[PDB]
Design a protein around this ligand. Structure first.
Ligand SMILES: [K+]
Ligand SMILES: [K+]
Ligand SMILES: [K+]
Ligand SMILES: [K+]
Ligand SMILES: [K+]
Ligand SMILES: [K+]
Ligand SMILES: [K+]
Ligand SMILES: [K+]
Ligand SMILES: [K+]
Ligand SMILES: [Mg+2]
Ligand SMILES: [Mg+2]
Ligand SMILES: [Mg+2]
Ligand SMILES: [Mg+2]
Ligand SMILES: [Mg+2]
Ligand SMILES: [Mg+2]
Ligand SMILES: [Mg+2]
Ligand SMILES: [Mg+2]
Ligand SMILES: [Mg+2]
Ligand SMILES: [Mg+2]
Ligand SMILES: [Mg+2]
Ligand SMILES: [Mg+2]
Ligand SMILES: [Mg+2]
Ligand SMILES: [Mg+2]
Ligand SMILES: [Mg+2]
Ligand SMILES: [Mg+2]
Ligand SMILES: [Mg+2]
Ligand SMILES: [Mg+2]
Ligand SMILES: [Mg+2]
Ligand SMILES: [Mg+2]
Ligand SMILES: [Mg+2]
Ligand SMILES: [Mg+2]
Ligand SMILES: [Mg+2]
Lengths: 201, 352, 109, 139, 190
RNA sequence: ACCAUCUGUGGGAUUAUGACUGAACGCCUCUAAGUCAGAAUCCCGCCCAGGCGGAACGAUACGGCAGCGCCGCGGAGCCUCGGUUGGCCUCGGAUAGCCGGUCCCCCGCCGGGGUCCGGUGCGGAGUGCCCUUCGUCCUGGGAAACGGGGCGCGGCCGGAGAGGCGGCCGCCCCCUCGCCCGUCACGCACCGCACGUUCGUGGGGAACCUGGCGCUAAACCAUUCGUAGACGACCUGCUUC
RNA sequence: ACGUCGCUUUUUGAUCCUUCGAUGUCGGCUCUUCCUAUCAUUGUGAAGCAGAAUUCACCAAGCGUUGGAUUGUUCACCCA
RNA sequence: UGGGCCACUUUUGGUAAGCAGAACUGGCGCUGCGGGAUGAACCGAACGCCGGGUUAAGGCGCCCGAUGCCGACGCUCAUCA
RNA sequence: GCUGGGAAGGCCCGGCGGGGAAGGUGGCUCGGGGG
């Protein structure tokens, strides 16, 4: 679509979410992924940590400053995973990669906006409940990431402000339900039209 | 095949961009960890390497061969005239790091401080902070200044004060002052802003930052040596005299494969003028500096309770390639990076 | 007073992995994510509308910078709602991931 | 935690497959994945059926396992499921979802008009309640 | 093979009540409150009786590995009932050949000082887990009494003491010195 | 110049291993679920460099017509770049469970718990919701009338993680219109036809006119310094007390 | 032990695929990096582990593994 | 032209060899194309310049055309899967 | 159209019956609950 797609990274498997996001950006869609620290990877944590430590070992022996760049932030880790699923050495792939914005936590532009979910990449449906998984935030923290604590504090601040918004939203909805009861005689004419056509059961 | 006999590599790879420092002052790069339990204090200072001398003291180290024994010890004199606080910076912690939130500068910024803002003070018209100082007097500006302090008090985690040295007290040719952000530690953000606000435009002597016989870190830029070969830069073995095209070289700069010269091989380049931090430098004395109450009092600089001689720290004929030390000074144990009259940063120890 | 056309995306040309047949294009129509739903769009006129630098004549209007390459949906591609389209001229590769309009003109309903 | 159970006589709603949208009764269970399934009053003859296409309802019939279709129909007709099903919120959401899909262009226009008036009257009254509740002057 | 139902019931005594919040068992006996979650196990917990207080654990369609968790939860719950009704008491003996092991109990039985283990000058400081109190018994010369409500915490506190007094670089079969858990039991003896 | 002298550092997850609780296997068991301790290893810190990566702040060009900034959508236009064709302004989350509402208790008038009542193939539903565009003229009934709309002003509050946004008052100035159902006719009805319909007063660059409010600086070279140096570069000084 | 299964490419063969309009052919010196099949050091398990010493094994390549006489030697041998 | 080489199978020497030597058919050499990521010899198929339809071998998370099927039944947790 | 001239299946409470049982209904017995 023409609008930006904002996806919540919590509870989403890394590769499965990256595959969906990669095809979306190749189709001209702007995608924003927030809470990349909440992304999950299947398999126990130690095993997934070994995979990144093996990644850390791959470096140019002659000059590591030129070699593979190992990004430790969860947002950049997810960004690199998507980059491995795009033709990033062509102009089409670079254009697609520039349509992806990745964030740790939820920054102020997107904290006030509704966030989508990809069921085909969710851990609850894609992974057996008895299997072990790893958190991208924990994996990032123990391999070099430096902002797990500050992101946690800011995410806790954001959650407190969101609860206040939800209580106002719930108070507004309660008032709307009371309003519907109050004006029922002057509404049943239009209520009946809605019911005949499947709206407002 | 393997090298016949083992030998440790020459030089450290922790200092690899063996390049000229991008800065001349020497930045702190790491302030002591802040805990609000401690009283509000400053963590850094700027001094100038005046020179070196040696002292005689009595060692109180039990179980040592030098216990209750005289020793002599080389010391470095770092002239430390008082800082002047001319601003406050606030920082906010972000998932991308610390970013500068808001900066407030005091009224009445000294000329020596304002010289730092210009590349040609001679041709300049001294306009820096001329329109900013007016907001300290009008009512809209003061209200905006109070909002800036309030926003710092509620949004910033660490604050720092911009302090500058006093050139005209120094015997150097340079009149341009040195500015440094000095972190304020030990207290709530509100407490350290109130502390910093009341020190604006004021002087902070080196007494209020450092104390006697405490261990500090010295941050500065080493002496420049120009462009040097591998024998001086990396202290590799000199080749035998019979070598055809030169013996002050590294014979093998790599194997056939990986087919490139590696970053670990010793190669000619800049030596010196590198940024370095040395930790665990003990303060042997903080000198009072010259005073005039009725007459010129020079005693306290180099008089000891055993010596009792009216002599300054200045050697006979003056500190060579520096001048005469008149202000406060810190006497550090041992040697310190940098040439004479090289600006040094003194930082509180990060260790316990 | 209304959009009057369906939003579609020029995903790419009909192709193997290592061979590209540029005469026909694969379009992704919004809201059509299964092959059984592509029946409505078969034979529908599709247009790639773009702008250029020089003015061109507009049918029933003053000349402007809008150009168009017309086409039509030929058949369904795959099982997930893609359709194949033939345009009078092969679509430029710069239009991949951009808007294609499906006109509804040749209506069978 | 669990309230609805696969059992003999349990009435299930078919979500997809050849018999989607129908009600069936579970007559017997086989191999954990399939069940012997019979809807005599809903036009589903006895046959195997995966548990994946079933969605259990709250209705349980009483008949022995693997009983003949006649006895299942008698149990289905007595305390009839067809009328009880149609009275549930589950069924009338299915029906409402069906009539909304079959709504024509004219019906869409009339719904758009009715929804417009209904929302303006409701949203007026919300403002009035808000303004009234705003008069809170008390220690 | 997947088994349809694997179930097992524990019997709750009268003086203790159990409250379920999903797979979070709260046990409220006379000696305190024990709380522990089992969200890592996909089981169904139910309070059955209003008169006898039965707690039933059910696993539906479980494989061999996850049928093993049915009795594990029941055993853990039974330890909660045991802990909040009788408590858990671990007795540790300090055995030594030459150097007597001096044990000093610091604040409220939460810190244990081992001085002269094998005659070395290093001081062992072992911190008890929260809710676990250590004390020196008045019955036998060399005993330590670890008392608490959670068997997990009391036994792990005892293991911390035992593993602190570990002989190194010697023959452990000859140098038997250390503090070892003598018996495991309860308080109130009922 | 070890041929003199000075300085060289903290944490985390854990390996091997040793254990706790504990089934499988009414016993046992370091393991299956769940826990503990754990290192010249590993990662980070300290330290070196600092992205075709950001931030905060300062000063921002005349004594003569001479450059610039902000405010006006102020106007008339040029050159160039094209995309797009309604919006959704947010609980936290669980999944062997959830969501909503209400009386007592506790927290200084709202949240937090305990009852109780509902919903749950999610209908307080993103398979959703909101807005909905032909325009006017007579003309009645309903909705409202405690209303609408002012790039009208003025004031205030909230938002810092990238706040670049959102909200509330006071005064003023206008419509009784705008929303639903009807009466009544009209508008280029351009004679079957495409790029129509929006964002949009779009972005960017020169330039003209038109008013108000404002500003009057630096950098580099040359010279000097020698804390620097192959050359560049770098640290410095140059009419005031 | 008798047997039997492998691994390695730091031995030496076997082959002759590349190079004969040319890839400078031993050793040493210098210098960097890598491997582990670990000599030492860190943390451990085992013993025919009393202690001391030693041996076997595990995680483990962070760090170190030297000065000399004879020999062109690689190797070798001895001194310390 | 009279240097051949490779593959299934048979087959001699050799511990073996991308070694050496035979038999048979096919191939590469002389051959492009689809697939095997990549590749003389493998699998499919051999070729004038094109449009439409359909396949072979091979595939259908994303790169990268095609499962975005409410695919079926099981097996498997690996601190070198 | 063919097939086992399809196999099953639906209705006729299928009726006169016979036999077999069990993934055992009612009843009965034993063990645990709600007035
Ligand atoms: K060598
Ligand atoms: K347009
Ligand atoms: K060989
Ligand atoms: K050869
Ligand atoms: K040759
Ligand atoms: K030699
Ligand atoms: K020699
Ligand atoms: K011939
Ligand atoms: K011939
Ligand atoms: Mg070696
Ligand atoms: Mg020579
Ligand atoms: Mg037991
Ligand atoms: Mg020993
Ligand atoms: Mg030395
Ligand atoms: Mg273990
Ligand atoms: Mg631990
Ligand atoms: Mg050649
Ligand atoms: Mg050559
Ligand atoms: Mg060569
Ligand atoms: Mg090993
Ligand atoms: Mg020939
Ligand atoms: Mg021949
Ligand atoms: Mg051969
Ligand atoms: Mg040959
Ligand atoms: Mg040939
Ligand atoms: Mg031929
Ligand atoms: Mg061929
Ligand atoms: Mg091919
Ligand atoms: Mg391959
Ligand atoms: Mg063809
Ligand atoms: Mg493929
Ligand atoms: Mg595809």
């Amino acid at each position: 679509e023409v609008q930006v797609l904002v996806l919540d990274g919590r509870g989403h498997l890394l590769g499965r979410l990256a595959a969906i996001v990669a095809k979306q950006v190749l189709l001209g869609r702007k995608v924003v992924v927030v809470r990349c620290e909440g992304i999950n990877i299947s398999g126990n944590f130690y095993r997934n940590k070994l995979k990144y430590l093996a990644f850390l070992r791959k470096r140019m022996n002659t000059n590591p400053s030129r070699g593979p760049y190992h990004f430790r932030a969860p947002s950049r880790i997810f960004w690199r995973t998507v980059r491995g699923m795009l033709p990033h050495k062509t102009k089409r792939g670079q254009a697609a990669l520039d349509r992806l914005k990745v964030f740790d936590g939820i920054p102020p532009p997107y904290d006030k906006k509704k966030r989508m979910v990809v069921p085909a990449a969710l851990k609850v449906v894609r992974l057996k409940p008895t299997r072990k998984f790893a958190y991208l935030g924990r994996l990032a923290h123990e391999v070099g990431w430096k902002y797990q604590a500050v992101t946690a504090t800011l995410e806790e601040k954001r959650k407190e402000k969101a609860k206040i918004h939800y209580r106002k939203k719930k108070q507004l909805m309660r008032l709307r339900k009371q309003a519907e009861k109050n004006v029922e005689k002057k509404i049943d004419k239009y209520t009946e039209v809605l019911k005949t056509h499947g709206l407002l059961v | 095949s393997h090298r016949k006999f083992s030998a440790p590599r020459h030089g450290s790879l922790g200092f690899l961009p063996r390049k000229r420092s991008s800065r001349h002052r020497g930045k702190v790069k790491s302030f002591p960890k802040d805990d609000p339990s401690k009283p509000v204090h400053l963590t850094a200072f700027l001094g100038y390497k005046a020179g070196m001398t040696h002292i005689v003291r009595e060692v109180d180290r039990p179980g040592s061969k030098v216990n209750k024994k005289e020793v002599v010890e080389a010391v470095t004199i770092v002239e430390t005239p008082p800082m002047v606080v001319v601003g406050i910076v606030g920082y906010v912690e972000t998932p991308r790091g610390l970013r500068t939130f808001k900066t407030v500068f005091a009224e009445h910024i000294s000329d020596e401080c304002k010289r730092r803002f210009y590349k040609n003070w001679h041709k300049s018209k001294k306009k820096a902070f001329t329109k900013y100082c007016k907001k300290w007097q009008d009512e809209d500006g003061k209200k905006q200044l109070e909002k800036d302090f309030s926003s710092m008090k509620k949004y910033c985690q660490v604050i720092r004060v911009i302090a500058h040295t006093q050139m005209r007290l120094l015997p150097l040719r340079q009149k341009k002052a040195h500015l440094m952000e000095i972190q304020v530690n030990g207290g709530t953000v509100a407490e350290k802003l109130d502390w910093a606000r009341e020190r604006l435009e004021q002087q902070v002597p080196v007494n209020q930052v450092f104390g006697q016989d405490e261990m500090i870190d010295v941050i500065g830029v080493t002496k420049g040596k120009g462009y040097k070969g591998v024998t001086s830069r990396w202290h590799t073995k000199k080749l035998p005299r019979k070598t055809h095209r030169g013996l002050r070289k590294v014979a093998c700069i790599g194997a056939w494969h990986p087919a490139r010269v590696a970053f670990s091989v010793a190669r000619a380049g800049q030596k010196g003028y590198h940024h370095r931090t040395e930790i665990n430098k003990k303060i042997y004395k903080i000198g009072q500096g010259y005073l005039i109450k009725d007459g010129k009092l020079i005693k306290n600089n180099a008089s000891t309770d055993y010596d009792l001689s009216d002599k300054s720290i200045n050697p006979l004929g003056g500190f060579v390639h520096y001048g005469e030390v008149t202000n406060d000074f810190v006497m550090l144990k041992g040697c310190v990076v940098g040439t004479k009259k090289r600006v040094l940063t003194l930082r509180k120890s990060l260790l316990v | 007073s209304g959009r009057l056309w369906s939003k579609a995306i020029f995903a790419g040309y009909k192709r193997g992995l290592r061979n590209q047949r540029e005469h026909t294009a694969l379009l992704k129509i919004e809201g059509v994510y299964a092959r059984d739903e592509t029946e409505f769009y078969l034979g529908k006129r599709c247009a790639y509308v773009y702008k250029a630098k020089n003015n061109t004549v507009t049918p029933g209007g003053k000349p402007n910078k809008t150009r168009v390459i017309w086409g039509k949906v030929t058949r369904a591609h795959g099982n997930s709602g893609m359709v194949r389209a033939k345009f009078r001229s092969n679509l430029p590769a710069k239009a991949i991931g951009h808007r294609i309009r499906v006109m509804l003109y040749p209506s069978r309903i | 935690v669990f309230r609805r159970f696969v059992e003999v006589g349990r009435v299930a709603y078919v979500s997809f497959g050849p018999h989607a949208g129908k009600l069936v009764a579970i007559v017997d269970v086989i191999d954990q994945n399939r069940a012997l399934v019979d809807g005599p009053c809903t036009q589903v003859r006895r046959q195997a059926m995966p548990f994946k296409c079933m969605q259990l309802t709250d209705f349980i019939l009483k008949f022995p396992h693997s009983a003949h279709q006649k006895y299942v129909r008698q149990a289905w007709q007595k305390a009839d499921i067809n009328t009880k099903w149609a009275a549930t919120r589950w069924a009338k959401k299915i029906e409402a979802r069906e009539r909304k899909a079959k709504m024509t262009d004219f019906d869409r226009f009339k719904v758009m008009k009715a929804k417009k008036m209904r929302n303006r009257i409701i949203k007026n009254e919300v403002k009035k309640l808000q303004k009234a509740a705003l008069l809170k002057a008390s220690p | 093979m997947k088994t349809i139902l694997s179930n097992q019931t524990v019997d709750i005594p009268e003086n203790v009540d159990i409250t379920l919040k999903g797979r979070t068992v709260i046990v409220k006996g006379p000696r305190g409150t024990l709380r522990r979650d089992f969200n890592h196990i996909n089981v169904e917990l139910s309070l059955l009786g209003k008169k006898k207080k039965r707690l039933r654990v059910d696993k539906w369609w479980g494989n061999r590995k996850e049928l093993a968790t049915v009795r594990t939860i029941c055993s853990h719950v039974q330890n909660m009932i045991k802990g909040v009704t009788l408590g858990f008491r671990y007795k540790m003996r300090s055995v030594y050949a030459h150097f007597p092991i001096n044990v000093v109990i610091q604040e409220n039985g939460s810190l244990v000082e081992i001085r002269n283990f094998l005659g070395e000058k290093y001081i062992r400081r072992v911190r008890m887990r929260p809710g676990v109190a250590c004390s020196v018994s008045q019955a036998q010369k060399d005993e330590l009494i670890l008392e608490g409500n959670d068997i997990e915490l009391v036994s792990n506190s005892a293991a911390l003491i035992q593993q602190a007094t570990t002989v190194k670089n010697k023959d452990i079969r000859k140098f038997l010195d250390g503090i070892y858990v003598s018996e495991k039991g309860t308080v109130q003896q009922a």
